[PDB]
Amino acid sequence: SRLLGFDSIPAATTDTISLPKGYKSSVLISWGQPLHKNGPAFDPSGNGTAAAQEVQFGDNNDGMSLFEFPGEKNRALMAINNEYTNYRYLYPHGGMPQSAEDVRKALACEGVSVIEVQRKNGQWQFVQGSRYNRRIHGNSPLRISGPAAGHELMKTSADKHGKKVLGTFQNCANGKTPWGTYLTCEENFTDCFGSSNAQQQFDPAQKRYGVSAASREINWHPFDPRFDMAKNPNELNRHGWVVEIDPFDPQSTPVKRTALGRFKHENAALAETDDGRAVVYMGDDERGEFIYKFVSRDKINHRNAKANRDILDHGTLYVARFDAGDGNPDHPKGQGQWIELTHGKNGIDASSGFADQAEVLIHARLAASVVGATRMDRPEWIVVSPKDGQVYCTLTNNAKRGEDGQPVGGPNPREKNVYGQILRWRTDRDDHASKTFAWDLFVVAGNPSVHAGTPKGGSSNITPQNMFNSPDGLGFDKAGRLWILTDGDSSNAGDFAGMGNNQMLCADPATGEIRRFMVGPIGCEVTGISFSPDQKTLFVGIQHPGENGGSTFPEHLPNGKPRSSVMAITREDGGIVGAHH
Ligand SMILES: Nc1ncnc2c1ncn2[C@@H]1O[C@H](COP(=O)(O)OP(=O)(O)CP(=O)(O)O)[C@@H](O)[C@H]1O
Ligand SMILES: [Ca+2]
Ligand SMILES: [Ca+2]
Ligand SMILES: [Ca+2]
Question: Which residues hold Ca(2+) 1 (predicted)?
Fold first, then answer.
């Protein structure tokens, strides 16, 4: 292969980072790192405070973007998401929150960490004390904008006007705008709400989003009533949005962009129409949910960044329908379309339960079902190829495929999907404004060693040497290599025998060839990806190392606490990551 310059490495089960020959890794930052001058040091005992966590690098680092510092090639900002927290390591008691202070500590773990990095002697390093360093957390005051801003369904007792919300949490993956802003995505936000009333009666919209009275083992609602649906039901509507952050302004207020819809947002892939308008592809990560696309009203003003302040507040939100395709078992392919989610069109009106456009966006999932969007196998990250504009999306898995309502077909070709697949689409005329597209499955993951010759053996570009499961993250480098990050079953047994720990692989889009590049430590998942502008440093996140107690990564101190870290991957020879030596 032209694009793949290294030799595929074996699967590993070790509590370390395994890379190919000539590559090295270094810790950039880890959960608990104080961001500010003379900031509180990380407390390994779990006795660190909530206020200290609001000024320290958050937990379970996930999606991230690197931003070129104008006029300074040896400086950059990185905006990094903090998705959730690991109670076993967060509290000394290692269990459920037991107080309001414990609840505040967990909300402090989530959100975004903006940091400055500098290049010293060729290596990028975290800059503690930088004026750009900032924590945006679960209690940070944010702004609401777009068509749903100020609506009755967005009003609460604490916020009577429906334009101010406390925080961003469950921050999964990201977007990087061409106008120098960061998009952070609220994914499993519903897990954080419960009800003091166990017999709480939830309405269709709330049930469709998956809220429960018990919460999903988070339990903030018994101590913080903002999360208690019996007391603040509409707080559920003020989360599950795409939030826009300016990393270059530490005194700016982030904005929830309600025109991009409300759902369990994984990431946001930027593109541009041939007439210059912003396009944002977006996945809703839940079994049988949809793939969306937002197109801005206005053209991107590339020459004046601040002229695009309100670009994501005006446009059209669409949802995907995929046809049955040709049924080819190794490489199925077909056509699809984008259906508009606008009040008054496609049977979206008072009769189907939408009084206005704000309701269409607050209840995007319900509006997408009305227009007949295709139910998918957990859409996770999306990426647009920088060389030809083809779009790639992971469908991580779907153990419910084949059950009543989720039939087997087109881009979801297997029942009880434990491995996943990567879906590709080419927009018509290579214009991102087109309402139709050709689709194909770039890869169908599987285990050819244990299920040779069957659908569970995967597509032909999966071999016993490169096999993996549950692809989640994706990233392109400038050369056009596709980097696949996994968040799967690390048992290394049964269906996953020979797969080992979670990994990162590299693929050639034109050939379909895939090669294992990295293996992560015990109990982690590999998520988050950014490159230095020169492509000589690949930054990757290691999330929840030792989630089931088998890790001391990265420090490996005696009886050590494992810490979610951001890693800097480089070549000893100083060359471009993934390229030939
Ligand atoms: N009690 C429950 N009821 C319903 N859905 C649940 C659930 N527990 C987890 N899920 C969902 O089932 C899927 C698989 O769970 P899991 O936590 O293993 O996935 P994940 O590790 O892929 C989360 P992420 O999307 O952040 O990577 C996810 O979409 C998760 O949100
Ligand atoms: Ca993910
Ligand atoms: Ca996942
Ligand atoms: Ca995960």
Answer: 266, 380, 472
